[PDB]
Scaffold this active site. Sequence first.
Site, PDB file in Angstrom:
ATOM      1  N   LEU A   1       0.798  -1.220   0.000  1.00 25.94           N
ATOM      2  CA  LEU A   1       0.000   0.000   0.000  1.00 25.94           C
ATOM      3  C   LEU A   1       0.834   1.275   0.000  1.00 25.94           C
ATOM      4  O   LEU A   1       0.412   2.273  -0.592  1.00 25.94           O
ATOM      5  CB  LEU A   1      -0.935   0.012   1.216  1.00 25.94           C
ATOM      6  CG  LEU A   1      -1.985  -1.103   1.231  1.00 25.94           C
ATOM      7  CD1 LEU A   1      -2.602  -1.255   2.612  1.00 25.94           C
ATOM      8  CD2 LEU A   1      -3.069  -0.842   0.191  1.00 25.94           C
TER       9      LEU A   1
ATOM     10  N   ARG B   1       5.202   2.914   0.694  1.00 27.28           N
ATOM     11  CA  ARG B   1       6.592   2.704   1.073  1.00 27.28           C
ATOM     12  C   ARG B   1       7.302   4.045   1.161  1.00 27.28           C
ATOM     13  O   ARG B   1       7.323   4.805   0.190  1.00 27.28           O
ATOM     14  CB  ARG B   1       7.313   1.791   0.072  1.00 27.28           C
ATOM     15  CG  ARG B   1       8.797   1.593   0.380  1.00 27.28           C
ATOM     16  CD  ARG B   1       9.446   0.564  -0.543  1.00 27.28           C
ATOM     17  NE  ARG B   1       9.083  -0.809  -0.192  1.00 27.28           N
ATOM     18  CZ  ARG B   1       9.738  -1.567   0.686  1.00 27.28           C
ATOM     19  NH1 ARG B   1      10.804  -1.101   1.322  1.00 27.28           N
ATOM     20  NH2 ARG B   1       9.320  -2.801   0.933  1.00 27.28           N
ATOM     21  N   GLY B   2       7.882   4.320   2.324  1.00 31.37           N
ATOM     22  CA  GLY B   2       8.735   5.476   2.501  1.00 31.37           C
ATOM     23  C   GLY B   2      10.137   5.047   2.873  1.00 31.37           C
ATOM     24  O   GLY B   2      10.519   3.899   2.627  1.00 31.37           O
TER      25      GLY B   2
ATOM     26  N   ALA C   1       9.372   3.441   6.696  1.00 28.11           N
ATOM     27  CA  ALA C   1       8.069   2.850   6.960  1.00 28.11           C
ATOM     28  C   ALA C   1       7.560   2.134   5.717  1.00 28.11           C
ATOM     29  O   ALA C   1       7.867   2.521   4.587  1.00 28.11           O
ATOM     30  CB  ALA C   1       7.067   3.915   7.413  1.00 28.11           C
TER      31      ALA C   1
ATOM     32  N   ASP D   1       0.438  18.004   8.974  1.00 33.64           N
ATOM     33  CA  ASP D   1       0.843  17.332   7.745  1.00 33.64           C
ATOM     34  C   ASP D   1      -0.383  16.880   6.960  1.00 33.64           C
ATOM     35  O   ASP D   1      -0.417  15.760   6.438  1.00 33.64           O
ATOM     36  CB  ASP D   1       1.753  16.142   8.064  1.00 33.64           C
ATOM     37  CG  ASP D   1       2.598  15.712   6.877  1.00 33.64           C
ATOM     38  OD1 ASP D   1       2.711  16.490   5.906  1.00 33.64           O
ATOM     39  OD2 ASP D   1       3.162  14.596   6.916  1.00 33.64           O
TER      40      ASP D   1
HETATM   41  N1  LIG Z   1      -4.949   2.398   6.717  1.00 30.22           N
HETATM   42  C1  LIG Z   1      -4.594   2.461   5.432  1.00 30.22           C
HETATM   43  N2  LIG Z   1      -5.377   1.880   4.501  1.00 30.22           N
HETATM   44  C2  LIG Z   1      -4.992   1.965   3.211  1.00 30.22           C
HETATM   45  N3  LIG Z   1      -3.901   2.574   2.785  1.00 30.22           N
HETATM   46  C3  LIG Z   1      -3.091   3.169   3.688  1.00 30.22           C
HETATM   47  C4  LIG Z   1      -3.423   3.122   5.040  1.00 30.22           C
HETATM   48  N4  LIG Z   1      -2.465   3.778   5.726  1.00 30.22           N
HETATM   49  C5  LIG Z   1      -1.554   4.226   4.835  1.00 30.22           C
HETATM   50  N5  LIG Z   1      -1.933   3.857   3.583  1.00 30.22           N
HETATM   51  C6  LIG Z   1      -1.274   4.120   2.447  1.00 30.22           C
HETATM   52  O1  LIG Z   1       0.118   4.101   2.682  1.00 30.22           O
HETATM   53  C7  LIG Z   1       0.720   5.385   2.372  1.00 30.22           C
HETATM   54  C8  LIG Z   1       1.730   5.760   3.426  1.00 30.22           C
HETATM   55  O2  LIG Z   1       1.118   5.785   4.697  1.00 30.22           O
HETATM   56  P1  LIG Z   1       1.642   6.916   5.794  1.00 30.22           P
HETATM   57  O3  LIG Z   1       0.946   6.689   7.090  1.00 30.22           O
HETATM   58  O4  LIG Z   1       1.298   8.337   5.253  1.00 30.22           O
HETATM   59  O5  LIG Z   1       3.229   6.781   5.981  1.00 30.22           O
HETATM   60  P2  LIG Z   1       4.456   7.754   5.641  1.00 30.22           P
HETATM   61  O6  LIG Z   1       5.044   8.290   6.898  1.00 30.22           O
HETATM   62  O7  LIG Z   1       5.551   7.009   4.850  1.00 30.22           O
HETATM   63  O8  LIG Z   1       3.930   8.906   4.784  1.00 30.22           O
HETATM   64  C9  LIG Z   1      -0.428   6.389   2.392  1.00 30.22           C
HETATM   65  O9  LIG Z   1      -0.178   7.465   1.483  1.00 30.22           O
HETATM   66  C10 LIG Z   1      -1.595   5.526   1.931  1.00 30.22           C
HETATM   67  O10 LIG Z   1      -1.633   5.507   0.503  1.00 30.22           O
HETATM   68 MG   LIG Z   2       2.242  10.224   4.886  1.00 30.48          MG
END
Ligand SMILES: Nc1ncnc2c1ncn2[C@@H]1O[C@H](COP(=O)(O)OP(=O)(O)O)[C@@H](O)[C@H]1O
Ligand SMILES: [Mg+2]
Length: 287
Positions: free
Chosen positions: A22, A24-25, A28, A141
């Site tokens: 879903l 990737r950073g 995380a 954010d």
């Molecule tokens: N609960 C979720 N259900 C579906 N997709 C998710 C969910 N949480 C995160 N994602 C997907 O994963 C991506 C990264 O999640 P995020 O929490 O923003 O981490 P980061 O710190 O890398 O930005 C989000 O942009 C979203 O597309």
């Molecule tokens: Mg994010």
Amino acid sequence: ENLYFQSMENFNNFYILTSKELGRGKFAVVRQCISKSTGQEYAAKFLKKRRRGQDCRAEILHEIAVLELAKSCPRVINLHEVYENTSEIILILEYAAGGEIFSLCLPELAEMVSENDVIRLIKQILEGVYYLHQNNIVHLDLKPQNILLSSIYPLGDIKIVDFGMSRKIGHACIMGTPEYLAPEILNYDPITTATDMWNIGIIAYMLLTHTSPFVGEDNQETYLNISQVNVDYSEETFSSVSQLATDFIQSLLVKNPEKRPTAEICLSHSWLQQWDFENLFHPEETS
Ligand SMILES: Nc1ncnc2c1ncn2[C@@H]1O[C@H](COP(=O)(O)OP(=O)(O)O)[C@@H](O)[C@H]1O
Ligand SMILES: [Mg+2]
Ligand SMILES: [Cl-]
């Protein structure tokens, strides 16, 4: 180091990961998973504990406490379970099957979003922000990539995620995507709830025009656009946007934070007042 949360052995006993990645950073990863007992779908976020040569376990704990405090708000993602191993803490989150609201800001799908839909989604975002501010929490954010949808066909409800930058009001302050930074951040001013309201103005601008209000040819131009608040309100860009929606945006994208309305005031804006025509309206004149 001793671990605090549930062991990795229990995780692989109760869940199985799927092939749908879903997100990737750099520190995380988010991957879909399924419960072996019930078959319910979830989103598992793997967070690294060491970053840039720094220990960040305490910061992760702070993020979990924020999620816990907002458990009863439907507009905020729910936390189900937590696990830990040598290098990672793992969050089991509610699954948002609709994806990012950013998909609706592109010129490709613009043909399927009506005015009624935009009005509803903005309203729901304001409900979540109002809840957070009432508890002295600032998200800091609110990008369209951190605001998800529970469903897409048909359109579902809002779910806010990513609390890595959460703070209390008054904390000291310059990173992230430049096009989403408020002017007070570039000036090293203290944090305020008005910062989140500036970002709400950008969300509405992108949903209605399908363009970015501040991005420039390079980072230098982006910063000039922000500090000067140079926004395009031209005929060509706003030919199909109503005046009331234009008023909503122009009251939020102002340089001085003290002039922006609060979340509670925004929920009373005339642009968001709409009567469900399937209900029986009771006028002021009685029989
Ligand atoms: N609960 C979720 N259900 C579906 N997709 C998710 C969910 N949480 C995160 N994602 C997907 O994963 C991506 C990264 O999640 P995020 O929490 O923003 O981490 P980061 O710190 O890398 O930005 C989000 O942009 C979203 O597309
Ligand atoms: Mg994010
Ligand atoms: Cl993984």
